[PDB]
């Protein structure tokens, strides 16, 4: 868990590593903290895994139902009002902290909701195990108005500061760029700094090493 | 006491060139007392396989819950459910019980009758999904497996070599786990033909 | 852990497993659960890995001073007393150890003394301490006879530890055997429980509910 | 056991081609209260070492005393007391670590995190941590409190490995360490705005800078933030 | 015997100055130490003074070094 | 805990179940029957928490019997134990769960095979050649691992079971006041009132 | 409440070869979810051709070792610079450890070297003194991920001679220091993949009848 | 707890003491002698905490014996029990107290009268016609209140004591593995190895 | 569990014209189990009487401690200690153990061989003294006694009437106390002649 | 427990009720909280009974030993320095709060020491269960300089306010007046407001009511 988000001139960008923990052992070596609420509305989820991926799921589905019925593109504060209204109802027993970002026919937006339903806004946000790492890489190299490439370069250079200095985060970087009057771009692996070197021996066994007791061919249909 | 370690057990899945393998031990015991060595953790609905670990009473219930569910599916859509369409299910399913979870660690694995591509997936008790192109492990000897799989695994093994690699991982972790063993069984799943095998292992 | 010892015409028979475990993982399958106090006495190892190993090795030094002074073999009773006494001094402090001190002197014949950190000191003929003690006791209770041959006395101890090994998750590995005589103890090897099972099932018929 | 009352926060530091740096504001918190400022956490020792202390102040004040007396003592019957045979960083630190441990081992610790920076008499750089548990470790960069979470990261984008110290200009080292001190003050309710940075160059010697502050900040972009999602005015 | 005791007290003093501070005990210091110990035995009742002289040598941060100690506590550097 | 043993042989199942009943310091009875026949060829022993124990047993018995007159057909051992595991399964996640462990041993007149199912209060079911609940296993399981054979006669099983009890007596701290044995087969249930009358 | 203990991650490993012995151990040093140094050795030569490493709570480790080394020093002082037989060493370490039976050193220590016949030799220790002559022992944070592997490889477990069914166990031959280090390296990389407390670097000390050799290899800085 | 009975009759004292020894789940022995003769005509049974139990017994025995050769005279039941209560009395207020309960039954060759003293770990001593420690009293005390008479023969006492045991068996949850009896009188101590050989 | 109520028991003292009376029950039991009915709580050193309640093992020890002490006194001063000179003692005595007290409630009572005046006194575990011209009570049925004494007491009773009043108080409180009974004994102390009597009471 | 003290022109006076509690039951119906430290130095003790009567005891005895040796009348601050020095040593485990009062060849004094060793001074003090009662009767009717009879009248009219309104105090009042150049006067019962009315029946039984089982005449001497 190590996510960030930063908006520029015509849109906003968020990035997240891809490493699920579970104690000190690694579970997923290539996860995906970036979810889609609606075409141009995306979330970054830190904390309790199942919860964030299940909550975005929900809200998304409902907003899809909303726009259809109202015949207008999904605003971003809706997706926000929904999430934090739900998060609250459960006094924080649904540990999903996240960064919601997107663009509606009224500009570009960026928010950060905590577990209990509290929400805040700024131009750049960090949530996760290495939030303090990627927040020294943001309180240093930040300036108002940043090219698309600059914003992208900064966000992905924050995540990286998380990967290396934090144990609760690593592997690759994932990015999603939302630009006004334009479609959204999903960059599954805008980077791949970690790639296990090759082994020192081939560990394939010669056929017949393992001892068998019974064998047979099971059926399937009817 | 952790509810997910009273009964014990392990499950592991792997992918190869046009096939998958799913394997598990056989022991079911209460704490230290070994009770059975014929307790299988791998079931199947059509051409979709599911292995389950954790609290035995839940493992059983889930199988029944999914058999039940898949039979109703087939009947209604006039076709058997697919591996992905199924994963999504057992995930939602596990979650509808987010505040009184079943204490398990499922693992789906099959071949898609349309595309023809291999599939393996894992979940934790509340239903968080997890695809991987190489392997899935779950259980008491969970770590011993990650250690074996992160060594012996090799992309695109031939079904005959996959059987050897997967077996060896299972076999050896179960030996460093005090609550897993008493036999094992491994499956090698192809588009067609499915071969099942029981292995010989220490009985201690 | 499954350790045991017993008396009979041939003297004493000691048998143990070798599994050591941390939580639910097998940190080791190569433990020497038999402390060779000295050429004539053996102590087993239950309870605490170190407490058993440490004090019993200490005890050996004690016997040596005693023998040099009296110019005579120390008796199993006096040795077992020394141990339990030192143990009793630390009652409360948190030691931990169930143990069988086994010897066979000229005057007292073959003697087993169970001793633990509580301060208990029991004389006996059959003892089993461990997490598999209950299973070992089974095979043992039903088959023991004072007139057991030596060959069979060893096989009994072996089959006993095996029974535990199979059922008790915290027991297993390889059985280690010793036979204690009026001239000292004799090691009778280390047999891997893995291999021994298949052997017994096959040559004894027992262990039917196991497919293999 | 015990509990710390008055407390100094972080103490960041790093190495370069000719020497090492070490900073640490001057605030001595009393819980949520900031009851102090004329607090100095950089205790130089001799003419080649400096010790940045964090944690309980009463215990820091205690060590300092110990250090002074360690000095006034090395002289006792030793004419080279300022040349050949005069306290090195490694002597000081070895001695300190000893005490620290000896203490936890008596269940009566000194609630502190410590950094001993300096340059050996033969010119080598010396940077080593040591907290109330006795745990110690070396590294290019070091920091207490948040330093470990917020400083470190930055001071690593500079010297990522043991093969960069040689190419780190005494000037670049500092310009970072201070931007770091900007960050520390940006996000850490227990920190002060003005500090004390001390350098230990093998050529120039010891430079003990005092009372400075963090300039070059960005709060303008605040006017733009309004409410938390709905408020438009 | 006396020498044993002395040389031994010395081995100790060096070890302390090594573990604690991690600095090799300077030779001059070893003199003071052997003098102050020999000292005590010339000022109290009941005992006797060490009957043994020693020539100490070493190499600290001041290069070579030689000393000559006598049972009266007089260590001179030659 | 109480004693609950059971073993399947050539063509029948045998159930052993201690007779004592203890409330704290005293023993209010030394002739209690922990059994309860669900149908002509299905028998079920139990042991667990004081009140929960027989309230549950009778409940199960009532359902089976109801089903049997309704269908006029007899439910099979396999399906009977399945129903039980279902209930207990739901039980574990309810305001207050029954704390009852059981053994079901019936004769499947359809396959002409005896079957024995062992189920614990959590809903954990397993088919075995022989079983036991609670601490009862540690003292016996090894003896049975040793001598049991599937070809055994009813006559041989008893002899075996006798050994297990003798062991339970020699090494168990509690005095269970003996056991009561019962046999299930093609002809139904009968009580070996001669392991007691011995 | 003051708690005197801490876990600084780490993993060490010791294999005993036919006539040499090794003892490796990564260099990363941690505290909770952070990094304290990517290179801080935990494997030292103690003299008389004996390598030792104490892993667990950093400080107790340094203490034991220092305490052991000062002990080798005096063994010489009192018995005419006689060499310390590695067996004699373990017995000694026991007393050191058991010395604090009621305020235990929170560490798993391991020594390794050569016996009095020239054969390799390893020794694993309880955190209170229980020692056994092991021939291959992983101790530390990820020991549970390397032991199953060596079991299989160094000791050929669960491997049988093809075409003989479960009847002939594959025979064990003994590995050349070369092969052992290839084994050791693969084990540590795997471990870094799946365990967040392992990474950064791997330092290895080889004991042979010529002295002690040291080799290093960089690991991923996840 | 263990069983400790004792009863004084016409001219002697009788002591009953269960034989089993149990460590947790198993029974390491069913032939333990909780007795320990302090002198030719003083006998003392005990029951309590695992280690404390016999370390104490032997200690007491050592003191009495020492006194006896020294004085060459034999200490009296009354004075012997007094000494014991003294020690245990000091024990209760010490870093760690012995948790041992006891029964002392000797023959006072000076008055030609048998005497039985019952003492608990707290230092509480009392002279009684019959006694017991722990839970042992609730099952017996009424039977003895009923039949006991001071004129009873040694021969009659045993018969009585037999009844108490039979009751202990019928209503006590623990299986104490029988008792071992011993008689103290003008001729010393002897063991009724026929309550066991019966 | 209160250490001063495991064993149980009661003691009461009264003053009359040239005499005193001291009485107590006889029971000693553990919790509910009644163990003895011959356990006396009243002792005497010379012409001084002391009754003690509370933890039996301490009651016994104290008697021995005071016997011991008084014998040494007599020998040294060549005269028996007096009631007041004694009270002061058992008070200091109890106190020297202020941080690990004996769990008792003593009650002194005698006649002064010089003055000839009656005396009765009470103390609590740490030794606080307490004289009274009428009565002292202590024990488990402590309250039942204050209720009886604060009714049946009468200044200057004749020894023959005192015996009747004191007996009745004891007798009736012990009946409303579950841990006191099984018999009683009462003493009537004059300058000379001391009469001791055992009473008949319910044995439940 | 309800004590007070007040000084006037030529001395000081303290008063205390006489009722020891012990739960809700009354123990002593006529106690004596007033102790003598030395002829003209007296204490009033509230709280844990045995403690105050045993501590005054001590200090008294020592001061007697002090004056004798120094050949001068006992100062009052000595008795104070002693008490609070002792009280402190025992971190309040000797619950004795009290009011020390007296007169030495340097004037009249009045102090109040709490359990932990804390001491305070004023012209009038109250300590006990009914301190708030008798402290409303002091913060109302108090004036500087009060006749001896006034001081006495006030102090005894404070105690009375304690007796009636408090349950942890009652029965009679006890007073002690210390005057300069004069001996001290101890007034055991300067008041007796409570005196049980006479009963309604004579409860004497007819001789022979009680049933006896045995009788005999026990001995005493030798």
D198 is written with which tokens? Answer: 């001390």
**Contacting subunits of B (3+ beta carbon pairs below 8 A):** A, C, F, G
Domain that holds residue A86: 1-222
**For position C89, which CATH number holds?**
3.60.20.10
Angle between helices B56-77 and F77-91 (to 10 degrees): 110
* Cβ within 8 Å, pair H96-C121: no
Specify the 3-state DSSP secondary structure of B61: helix
* Cβ within 8 Å, pair H50-C92: no
Q: How far is C174 from chain A (nearest CA, A)?
A: 21
The answer to whether the CB of J170 falls within 8 A of the CB of J28 is no
| C-alpha count within 13 angstroms, C-beta hemisphere, residue G218 | 8
Which residues of C fall in the annotated binding site for bortezomib? 49
Contacts of G216 (CB under 8 A, 6+ apart): G201, G202, G203, G204
CA pair distance I128, I106, nearest whole angstrom: 11
Name the DSSP letter for residue D147.
I
Residue I91's nearest CA partner among I134, I56, I62, I132 is I62
If one counts the domains in chain G, the total is: 1
**For position A128, which CATH number holds?**
3.60.20.10
CA pair distance I45, I63, nearest whole angstrom: 9
**Burial class of D65 by CB neighbour count within 10 A (0 to 12, 13 to 18, 19+):** exposed
The CA-CA-CA angle for residues H32, H33, H35, to 5°, reads 155
* Cβ within 8 Å, pair A25-G195: yes
* Cβ within 8 Å, pair A133-D153: yes
F81 is written with which tokens? Answer: 């134990």
| C111 given a catalytic annotation | no
Q: Which domains does chain D have, with CATH numbers?
A: 1-233 (3.60.20.10)
Residue G195's nearest CA partner among G138, G142, G139 is G142
The answer to whether the CB of A179 falls within 8 A of the CB of A10 is yes
* Cβ within 8 Å, pair F149-C142: no
The CA-CA-CA angle for residues J39, J45, J50, to 5°, reads 105
- State which residue of chain B sits closest to G151, comparing Cα positions: B172
| C-alpha count within 13 angstroms, C-beta hemisphere, residue F147 | 21
CA pair distance H105, H16, nearest whole angstrom: 11
* Cβ within 8 Å, pair A211-B194: no
Q: Does H52 touch chain C (CB under 8 A)?
A: yes
Nearest to A203 among B142, B151, B200 (CB): B151
CA pair distance H11, I21, nearest whole angstrom: 39
If one counts the domains in chain A, the total is: 1
Cα E15 off chain centre by: 13
G111 DSSP β-pair partners: G52, G123
H92 is written with which tokens? Answer: 């209760």
Write out chain C residues lying below 8 Å of F171, CB-based.
Answer: 134, 137, 141
Q: How far is E20 from chain D (nearest CA, A)?
A: 5
Greatest CA separation found in chain H? Answer: 48
* Cβ within 8 Å, pair F172-H172: no
Helices within chain G (DSSP H only): 58-78, 86-99, 143-154, 177-194
The CA-CA-CA angle for residues A101, A107, A112, to 5°, reads 25
The CA-CA-CA angle for residues F56, F61, F66, to 5°, reads 130
Q: How far is E13 from chain G (nearest CA, A)?
A: 14
Greatest CA separation found in chain I? Answer: 47
CA dihedral B139, B141, B142, B147 (to 10 degrees): -150
Nearest to G186 among A24, A199, A212 (CB): A199
Q: Which of C18, C19, C22, C24 to mutate to test the interface with B (most CBs of B within 10 A)?
A: C24
CA pair distance H65, H43, nearest whole angstrom: 12
| C-alpha count within 13 angstroms, C-beta hemisphere, residue B194 | 21
Residue A154's nearest CA partner among A130, A135, A171 is A135
Residue G73 has φ and ψ, to the nearest 5°, of: -50, -50
Q: Which domains does chain F have, with CATH numbers?
A: 1-198 (3.60.20.10)
C204 is written with which tokens? Answer: 């004894």
Q: Does D98 touch chain E (CB under 8 A)?
A: yes
Q: Does I54 touch chain J (CB under 8 A)?
A: no
J11 DSSP β-pair partners: J179
Nearest to D94 among E21, E60, E62 (CB): E21
Contacts of H13 (CB under 8 A, 6+ apart): H6, H7, H43, H105, H106, H107, H114, H115, H116, H183, H184, H185
Nearest to I168 among J25, J210, J220 (CB): J210
The answer to whether the CB of B26 falls within 8 A of the CB of B184 is yes
Residue A135's nearest CA partner among A113, A162, A111 is A162
H185 DSSP β-pair partners: H188
Greatest CA separation found in chain G? Answer: 64
For J206, other C-beta atoms within 10 Å of its C-beta total 7
CA pair distance F2, F34, nearest whole angstrom: 9
A:G CB pairs within 8 Å: 65
Q: How far is H171 from chain F (nearest CA, A)?
A: 5
Residue with tokens 């100094």: D8
Q: Give the helix/strand (H/E) hosting G113.
A: strand G107-114
**Contacting subunits of H (3+ beta carbon pairs below 8 A):** C, F, I
H126 DSSP β-pair partners: H118
Write out chain C residues lying below 8 Å of H51, CB-based.
Answer: 88, 91, 118-120
E28 is written with which tokens? Answer: 């001059």
Residue D55's nearest CA partner among D8, D122, D107 is D8
- State which residue of chain J sits closest to I132, comparing Cα positions: J28
Helix, strand, coil shares of chain A, percent, nearest 5, are 25, 30, 45
Residue D14's nearest CA partner among D136, D205, D170, D206 is D170
* Cβ within 8 Å, pair F145-C134: no
What would the DSSP string read from start to end of C52-100? Answer: HHHHHHHHHHHHHHHHHHHTSPPPHHHHHHHHHHHHHHTTTTT---EEE
Residue F161, CA distances (Å) to C208, F122, F169, F170 in order: 17, 27, 13, 15
The answer to whether the CB of G98 falls within 8 A of the CB of G128 is yes
* Cβ within 8 Å, pair C212-A214: no
Residue H77, CA distances (Å) to C172, H81, H82, H153, J117 in order: 55, 6, 8, 21, 54
Residue with tokens 């050791």: G184
Resolution for the entry shown, Å: 3.2
Residue with tokens 């991690």: E22
CA pair distance F141, F134, nearest whole angstrom: 12
* Cβ within 8 Å, pair J218-I196: yes
B126 is written with which tokens? Answer: 């509340």
Nearest to B32 among C26, C131, C193 (CB): C131
Q: Give the helix/strand (H/E) hosting E11.
A: helix E2-19
CA pair distance C60, D228, nearest whole angstrom: 77
J108 DSSP β-pair partners: J103
D23 is written with which tokens? Answer: 């900073």
CA pair distance A83, A61, nearest whole angstrom: 12
CA pair distance I2, I4, nearest whole angstrom: 5
The CA-CA-CA angle for residues A211, A216, A217, to 5°, reads 135
Q: Which of G132, G148, G151 to mutate to test the interface with C (most CBs of C within 10 A)?
A: G132
If one counts the domains in chain I, the total is: 1
- Beta strands (DSSP E) in chain B are 10-16, 19-25, 28-30, 33-36, 42-45, 48-51, 107-111, 118-123, 129-131, 135-139, 184-189, 194-199
The answer to whether the CB of J143 falls within 8 A of the CB of J3 is no
G7 is written with which tokens? Answer: 């876990």
Helix, strand, coil shares of chain G, percent, nearest 5, are 30, 30, 40
Domain that holds residue B204: 1-204
Q: Which of I47, I128, I143, I166 to mutate to test the interface with J (most CBs of J within 10 A)?
A: I128
CB environment G123-139: b (16+ within 10 A), e (fewer): bbbbbbbbbbebebbbb
Q: Give the helix/strand (H/E) hosting F164.
A: helix F154-171
* Cβ within 8 Å, pair C139-F148: no
Contacts of H95 (CB under 8 A, 6+ apart): none
CA pair distance F34, F53, nearest whole angstrom: 9
Nearest to I161 among J22, J51, J204 (CB): J204
CA pair distance B168, A205, nearest whole angstrom: 9
CA pair distance C6, C158, nearest whole angstrom: 12
* Cβ within 8 Å, pair F135-H26: no
Sign of the Cα torsion C43, C49, C55, C57 reads: positive
Domain that holds residue C11: 1-212
Cα C2 off chain centre by: 8
* Cβ within 8 Å, pair H23-C116: yes
Residue C66 has φ and ψ, to the nearest 5°, of: -60, -40
What would the DSSP string read from start to end of C166-184? Answer: HHBTT--SEEEEEEEEBTE
The answer to whether the CB of G125 falls within 8 A of the CB of G93 is yes
| C-alpha count within 13 angstroms, C-beta hemisphere, residue F70 | 7
**Burial class of A212 by CB neighbour count within 10 A (0 to 12, 13 to 18, 19+):** middle
Nearest to G98 among C30, C31, C50 (CB): C50
CB environment B9-34: b (16+ within 10 A), e (fewer): bbbbbbbbeebbbbbbbbbbbbebbb
Q: Which technique was the structure solved with, according to the deposited record?
A: X-ray
CA pair distance F26, D183, nearest whole angstrom: 73
Write out chain G residues lying below 8 Å of B168, CB-based.
Answer: 152, 158-159
**Contacting subunits of J (3+ beta carbon pairs below 8 A):** I
Q: How far is E53 from chain G (nearest CA, A)?
A: 22
C:G CB pairs within 8 Å: 30
The CA-CA-CA angle for residues F189, F190, F195, to 5°, reads 135
Q: Does D85 touch chain E (CB under 8 A)?
A: yes
Write out chain E residues lying below 8 Å of D90, CB-based.
Answer: 22
Q: Which of G140, G143, G148 to mutate to test the interface with B (most CBs of B within 10 A)?
A: G148
Residue F108 has φ and ψ, to the nearest 5°, of: -85, 85
């Amino acid at each position: 868990t190590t996510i960030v988000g930063v908006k520029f001139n015509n849109g906003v960008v968020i990035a997240a590593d891809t490493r699920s923990t579970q104690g000190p052992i690694v579970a997923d070596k290539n996860c995906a903290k970036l979810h889609r609420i609606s075409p141009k509305i995306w979330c970054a989820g830190a904390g309790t895994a199942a919860d964030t991926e299940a909550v975005t799921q929900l809200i998304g589905s409902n907003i899809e139902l909303h726009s259809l019925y109202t015949s207008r593109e999904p605003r971003v504060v809706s997706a926000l009002q929904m999430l934090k209204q739900h998060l609250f109802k459960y006094q924080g027993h649904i540990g999903a902290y996240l960064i919601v970002a997107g663009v509606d026919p009224t500009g570009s937006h960026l928010f950060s909701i905590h577990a209990h339903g509290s929400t805040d806004v700024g131009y750049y946000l960090s949530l996760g195990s290495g939030s303090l790492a990627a927040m020294a890489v943001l309180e240093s190299h930040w300036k108002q108005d940043l090219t698309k490439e600059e914003a992208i370069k900064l966000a992905s250079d924050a995540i990286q500061a998380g990967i290396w200095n934090d144990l609760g985060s690593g592997s690759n970087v994932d990015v999603c760029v939302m630009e006004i009057g334009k479609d959204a771009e999903y960059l599954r692996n805008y980077l791949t700094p970690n790639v296990r070197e090759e082994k020192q021996k081939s560990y394939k066994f010669p056929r017949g090493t393992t001892a068998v007791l019974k064998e047979s061919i099971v059926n399937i249909c009817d | 006491s952790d509810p997910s370690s009273i009964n014990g057990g392990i499950v592991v899945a792997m992918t190869g060139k046009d096939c998958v393998a799913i394997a598990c031990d056989l022991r079911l015991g209460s704490q230290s007392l070994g009770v059975s060595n014929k307790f299988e953790k791998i079931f199947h609905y059509g051409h979709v396989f599911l292995g389950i670990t954790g609290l035995a009473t839940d493992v059983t219930t889930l199988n029944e819950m999914f058999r039940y569910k898949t039979n109703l599916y087939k009947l209604k859509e006039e076709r058997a459910i697919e591996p992905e369409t199924f994963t999504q299910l057992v995930s939602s399913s596990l979650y509808e019980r987010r505040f009184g979870p079943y204490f398990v660690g499922p693992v789906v694995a099959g071949i898609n009758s349309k595309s023809g591509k291999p599939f393996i997936a894992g979940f934790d008790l509340i239903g968080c999904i997890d695809e991987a192109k190489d392997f899935i492990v779950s259980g008491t000897a969970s770590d011993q497996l990650f250690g074996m799989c992160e060594s012996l695994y090799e992309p695109n093994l031939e079904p005959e070599d996959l059987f050897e690699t997967i077996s060896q991982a299972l076999l050896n972790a179960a030996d460093r786990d005090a609550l897993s063993g008493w036999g094992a069984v491994v499956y090698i799943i192809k588009k067609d033909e499915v071969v099942k095998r029981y292995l010989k292992m220490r009985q201690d | 852990t499954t350790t045991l010892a017993f008396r009979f015409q041939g003297g004493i028979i000691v048998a143990v497993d070798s599994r050591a475990t941390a939580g639910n993982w097998v940190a080791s399958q190569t433990v020497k659960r038999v402390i060779e106090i000295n050429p004539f006495l053996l102590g087993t190892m239950a309870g605490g890995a170190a407490d058993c190993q440490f004090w019993e090795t200490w005890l050996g030094s004690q016997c040596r001073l005693h023998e040099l002074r009296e110019k005579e073999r120390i008796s199993v009773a006096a040795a077992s007393k020394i141990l339990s006494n030192l143990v009793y001094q630390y009652k409360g402090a948190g030691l931990s150890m169930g143990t069988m001190i086994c010897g066979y002197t000229r005057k007292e014949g073959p003697t087993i003394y169970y001793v633990d950190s509580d301060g208990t000191r029991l004389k006996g003929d059959i003892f089993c301490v461990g997490s598999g003690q209950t299973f070992a006791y089974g095979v043992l209770d039903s088959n023991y006879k004072w007139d057991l041959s030596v060959e069979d006395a060893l096989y009994l101890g072996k089959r006993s530890i095996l029974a535990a090994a199979h059922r008790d998750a915290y027991s297993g590995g390889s059985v280690n055997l010793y036979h204690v005589t009026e001239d000292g103890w004799i090691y009778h090897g280390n047999h891997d429980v893995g291999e021994l099972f298949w052997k017994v099932k096959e040559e004894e018929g027992s262990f039917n509910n196991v497919i293999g | 056991t015990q509990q710390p009352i008055v407390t100094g926060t972080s103490v960041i530091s790093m190495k370069y081609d000719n020497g090492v740096i070490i900073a640490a504001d001057n605030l001595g918190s009393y819980g949520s209260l900031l009851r102090f400022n004329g607090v100095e956490r950089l205790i130089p020792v001799g003419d080649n070492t400096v010790v940045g202390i964090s944690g309980d102040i009463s215990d820091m004040q205690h060590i300092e005393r110990l250090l002074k007396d360690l000095v006034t003592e090395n002289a006792y019957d030793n004419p080279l007391a300022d040349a050949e045979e005069a306290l090195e960083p490694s002597y000081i630190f070895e001695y300190l670590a000893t005490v620290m441990y000896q203490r936890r081992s008596k269940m009566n610790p000194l609630w502190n995190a410590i950094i001993v920076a300096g340059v050996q008499s033969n010119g080598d750089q010396f940077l080593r941590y040591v907290n109330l548990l006795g745990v110690t470790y070396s590294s290019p960069t070091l920091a207490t409190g948040f330093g470990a979470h917020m400083a470190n990261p930055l001071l690593r984008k500079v010297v990522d490995r043991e093969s960069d110290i040689p190419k780190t200009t005494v000037q670049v080292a500092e310009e970072a360490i201070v931007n770091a001190m900007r960050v520390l003050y940006y996000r850490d309710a227990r920190s002060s705005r003005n500090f004390s940075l001390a350098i230990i160059d093998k050529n120039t010697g010891l430079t003990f800078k005092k009372n400075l502050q963090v300039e070059n900040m960005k709060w303008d972009f605040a006017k733009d933030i309004k409410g938390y999602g709905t408020q438009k005015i | 015997p006396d020498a044993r005791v002395l040389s031994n007290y010395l081995r100790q003093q060096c070890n302390y100055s090594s573990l604690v501070f991690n600095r090799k005990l300077a030779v001059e210091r070893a003199g003071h130490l052997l003098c102050d110990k020999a000292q005590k035995n010339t000022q109290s009742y009941g005992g006797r003074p060490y009957g043994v002289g020693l020539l100490i040598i070493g190499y600290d941060k001041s290069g070579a070094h030689l000393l000559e100690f006598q049972p009266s506590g007089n260590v001179t550097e030659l | 805990m109480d004693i609950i043993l059971g073993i399947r042989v050539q063509d029948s199942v045998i159930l052993a179940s201690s007779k004592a009943v203890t409330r704290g310091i005293s023993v209010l009875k030394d002739s209690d029957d922990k059994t309860r026949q669900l149908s002509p060829h299905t028998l079920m022993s139990f042991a667990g928490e004081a009140g929960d124990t027989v309230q549950f047993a009778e409940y199960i018995q009532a359902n089976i019997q109801l089903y049997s007159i309704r269908e006029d057909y007899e439910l099979s051992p396999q399906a009977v134990s399945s129903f039980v595991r279902q209930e207990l399964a739901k039980s574990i996640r309810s305001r207050r769960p029954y704390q009852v462990n059981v053994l079901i041993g019936g004769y499947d007149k359809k396959k002409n095979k005896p079957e024995l199912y062992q189920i614990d209060y959590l809903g954990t079911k397993v088919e075995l050649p022989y079983g036991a609940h609670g601490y009862s296993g540690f003292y016996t399981f090894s003896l049975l691992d040793h001598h049991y054979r599937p070809d055994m006669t009813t006559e041989e099983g008893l002899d075996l079971l006798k050994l297990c009890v003798q062991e339970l007596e020699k090494r168990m701290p509690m005095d269970f006041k003996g056991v009561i044995v019962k046999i299930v087969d093609k002809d139904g249930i009968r009580q070996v009132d001669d392991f007691q009358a011995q | 409440q003051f708690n005197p203990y801490g876990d600084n991650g780490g993993t060490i490993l010791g294999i005993a070869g036919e006539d040499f012995a090794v003892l490796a151990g990564d260099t990363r040093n941690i505290t909770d979810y952070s990094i304290n140094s990517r290179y801080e050795p935990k494997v030292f030569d103690c003299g008389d051709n004996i390598v030792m490493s104490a892993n667990g709570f950093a400080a107790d480790g340094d203490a034991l070792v220092k305490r052991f080394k000062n002990s080798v020093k005096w063994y010489h002082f009192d018995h005419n610079d006689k060499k310390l037989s590695i067996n004699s060493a373990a017995r000694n370490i026991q007393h050191l450890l058991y010395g604090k039976r009621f305020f235990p050193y929170y560490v798993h220590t391991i020594i390794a070297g050569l016996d009095e016949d020239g054969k390799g030799a390893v020794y694993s220790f309880d955190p209170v003194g229980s020692y056994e002559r092991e021939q291959c022992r992983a101790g530390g944070a990820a020991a549970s991920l390397i032991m199953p592997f060596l079991d299989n490889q160094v000791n050929f477990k669960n491997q049988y001679e093809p075409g003989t069914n479960g009847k002939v166990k594959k025979p064990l031959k003994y590995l050349s220091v070369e092969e052992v280090i290839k084994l050791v390296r693969d084990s540590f990389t795997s471990a870094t993949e799946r365990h967040i407390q392992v990474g950064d670097g791997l330092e290895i000390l080889i004991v042979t009848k010529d002295g002690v050799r040291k080799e290093f290899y960089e690991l991923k800085r996840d």
